[PDB]
Amino acid sequence: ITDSLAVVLQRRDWENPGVTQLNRLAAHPPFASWRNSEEARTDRPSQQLRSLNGEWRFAWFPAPEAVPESWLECDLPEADTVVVPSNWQMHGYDAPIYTNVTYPITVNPPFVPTENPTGCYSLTFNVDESWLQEGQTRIIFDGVNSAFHLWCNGRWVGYGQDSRLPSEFDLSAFLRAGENRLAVMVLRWSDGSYLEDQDMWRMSGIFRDVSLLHKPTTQISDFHVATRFNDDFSRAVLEAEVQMCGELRDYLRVTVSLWQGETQVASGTAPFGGEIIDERGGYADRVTLRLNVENPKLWSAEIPNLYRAVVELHTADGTLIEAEACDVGFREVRIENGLLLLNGKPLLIRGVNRHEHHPLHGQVMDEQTMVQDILLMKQNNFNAVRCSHYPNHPLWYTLCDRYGLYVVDEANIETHGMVPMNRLTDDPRWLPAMSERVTRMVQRDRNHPSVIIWSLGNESGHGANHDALYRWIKSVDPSRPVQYEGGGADTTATDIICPMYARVDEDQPFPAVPKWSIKKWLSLPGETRPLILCQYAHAMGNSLGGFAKYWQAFRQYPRLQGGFVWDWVDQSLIKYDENGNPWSAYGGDFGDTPNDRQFCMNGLVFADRTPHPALTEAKHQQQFFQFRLSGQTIEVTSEYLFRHSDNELLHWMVALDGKPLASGEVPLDVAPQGKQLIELPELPQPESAGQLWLTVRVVQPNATAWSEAGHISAWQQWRLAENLSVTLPAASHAIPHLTTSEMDFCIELGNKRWQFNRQSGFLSQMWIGDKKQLLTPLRDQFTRAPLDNDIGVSEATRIDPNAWVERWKAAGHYQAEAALLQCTADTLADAVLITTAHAWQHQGKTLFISRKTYRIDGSGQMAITVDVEVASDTPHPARIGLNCQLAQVAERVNWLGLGPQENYPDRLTAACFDRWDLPLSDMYTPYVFPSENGLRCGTRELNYGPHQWRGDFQFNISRYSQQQLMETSHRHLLHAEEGTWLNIDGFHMGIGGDDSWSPSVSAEFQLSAGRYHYQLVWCQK
Ligand SMILES: CC1(C)C(/C=C/c2ccc(O[C@@H]3O[C@H](CO)[C@H](O)[C@H](O)[C@H]3O)cc2)=[N+](CCCCCCCC(=O)O)c2ccccc21
Ligand SMILES: [Mg+2]
Ligand SMILES: [Mg+2]
Ligand code: NA
Known about the structure:
Bound molecules: ligand F4X, magnesium ion, sodium ion
Helix content: 10-25%
Oligomer: monomer
């Protein structure tokens, strides 16, 4: 009759933001309904919390009206068997859509398309007869994207929205003895989708755990854990509020126990009945228990000391009815005099935004991937994670509790694609839907100590609903600051100025929502709050240029307390090719249109969690140990707030142009915020030529729960003495001969022979024996394969004239062909010298001039001098150097300069100067969107096979031309070219990365001088 699909779907509850659930139970902290209290303290499994994960029957429909009525009674024969949890896009049933701002549906709230992909999950399962005669049996859906109706045994149970928070329903009256059948109809789109416009893949399905929980009729319905402290934290009080449902009776009592290991630290017991709260009395169904704790071990990210609270509901005669439990971190979060304090000390947030993404399972996470992310974060000096932009899987907070990470729990509210952004969040008709997303988050995660900051959501402007919900959290949970960046990052709905992509020194004064410089932002009249960037340093491919500038500002300004880098993972997806070889897909690679292509990849680690090179630049800048050194005394400073360096030694080394001369390892016993001065022993000071470099590293001898033994926590380098080569070079035993063609200038000397084309003006090729050496003439280069930062949002459709790639193209940097002006040759006693002079023009105007002279002496060496002019009105070049295609292909590359990893001018602080030797594999960075990559800076010795270059240059080297990288869109479509492409540059523009839609390379890294000069020397070996 009434459990019909006809009647249920007729309500169209998914096109009505006033109905966000039906018959859904109240929210609460994680429950397990342990019937034994030692089971609760131990955090065992519980015989009352069954998992329904596993094999379900699934069938896909284009619209819920297409679902046959029989599906409520029987299984559909057309249905496949599917593992749950699952995003059905990852099973291939329809495409995942990657859109950023633009809604994947027609913006017509509260309505959704008639084409509403419907996933009809079903599951036949058994229930013990004990669950049917006593108690309450409920089903828990931890995550259903994006809304669903629930049937059990053909009868309709309820409805749910908000896809990142659990939905629980009472099944007691619906369950049969023996076999039962669930039928959950998941809708891809709902009115809740208008609040779920996060910049991510748009997936759907039952993508989190499903569970049965059995509880007694008399039950713990909710419990809150609070910890107040005294002046110096030597004494804490743990307040525990416990609420019950069921038959209230005079013999019912509640005990709350606090443990740490096998030690019961405290406990108290009381009957129900709270304090009088107003004229009608108090809450008879509640009670508050206060437990004193002398010298409590405090919870930090540095030391995640956890107690365990056990909540026993029992009778006076001692019959245990039910037990719940939670981990407890003794920690106080407050903002005082403008600073965010944790346990009275000012935090410095080494944060990152982290989406729930897995390249194969989509948005279906587990435990191994979560622990892998957490280990990788702490191993790269990260103390905080923002759950951008929704409540995470419950296990995530438990893990940050234990491994020690500060967490910003963010409500599942983003209306980015609305025009304006506060069209829904300022509408009071949407306040209920938004309140449910906020209140149910707090009701779920309020006992997790790792949660230090509540967030109202992301990119939804500033509306009155934000103010109402901000004030609701402050009233319900004073334990935590509330932050929200929408509407200009400093509205009345945030305790923290939390801008996204605000720059350090540069004002971006957009109307109504200016992104002021973070330094200036603090200074604004009447402004007193701390500033923690909700998002900063857009790590889209080759990026994080200018990252050190942020952390200089963080350390110099007290109220600049850090921020969360955007972001942790590439949201790459996995496709399969001709032969089933996997490759990384991004926007549009599933036929999804419209889409925002590579903007789904902003991580410091690839989707497989392999690191990008920018990761160690973050690790270096966010390291907890700062170093100064005067002469021989290293000043090392702890930026830890709670721990001594009781598992850290400093290894030190001093090396002249690579070769080590002195080792050493002295222990470190620096106090939190303290200092320690280490006198270095008599370091050797040789009269030898070259630069002497000191390198100190902080090494953890013992294994942590997040590192292995020997892990490096921090490092720093200084150039000590440098003695300049004063020696007159070793005399020659031969004079090279010059040969003047009508077309060529050719020089010869033993094995070596060089050939300059007098019509081109370039070194066309050189010889060693009967073995050719070049496949392309050694020519200039003023361009690079554009990085995602140079492209920005520029597409073939809508072009971004302000983007760097478009300023270059419009001036003809890529179409510029050389036009030779002078190319001589002269016989000198010591050598032969050809001087060239090329000009680059496009549509008339001469952009660049490059006067060179090459000097091949008895030397066996070839001295190239380059003196480049660049017009004062052409856009600054991305590069000023040379490139050529080597015939040689060698297995290893050795160089003297900053390494070992990729590094660029505005991203080289993590690199160290040394002699580095890697396979050619690692001199190319496999950015999924190919670009310029693998560059090493500060280099003046490069050894590849028989060749050797020296000067003071920057170089990248691999199998890929930079017009192949430019004309290719996916890494898996690149093929090794014949030979080896090498770009040698005396200068190279920075990569930028404060954001990836505006030019973000600061003036000091723009090739803007006008005249330029570098010197290379080519030689065999
Ligand atoms: C300023 C700029 C670069 C621009 C930039 C808009 C812009 C940039 C970024 C953005 O969202 C950002 O995208 C990131 C992707 O990794 C992250 O999600 C980040 O959290 C988020 O803030 C949202 C909008 N548009 C693209 C506009 C598309 C519609 C978006 C909303 C702006 C509007 O229409 O008012 C044009 C178009 C022509 C010239 C210049 C521009
Ligand atoms: Mg609805
Ligand atoms: Mg957005
Ligand atoms: Na993005």
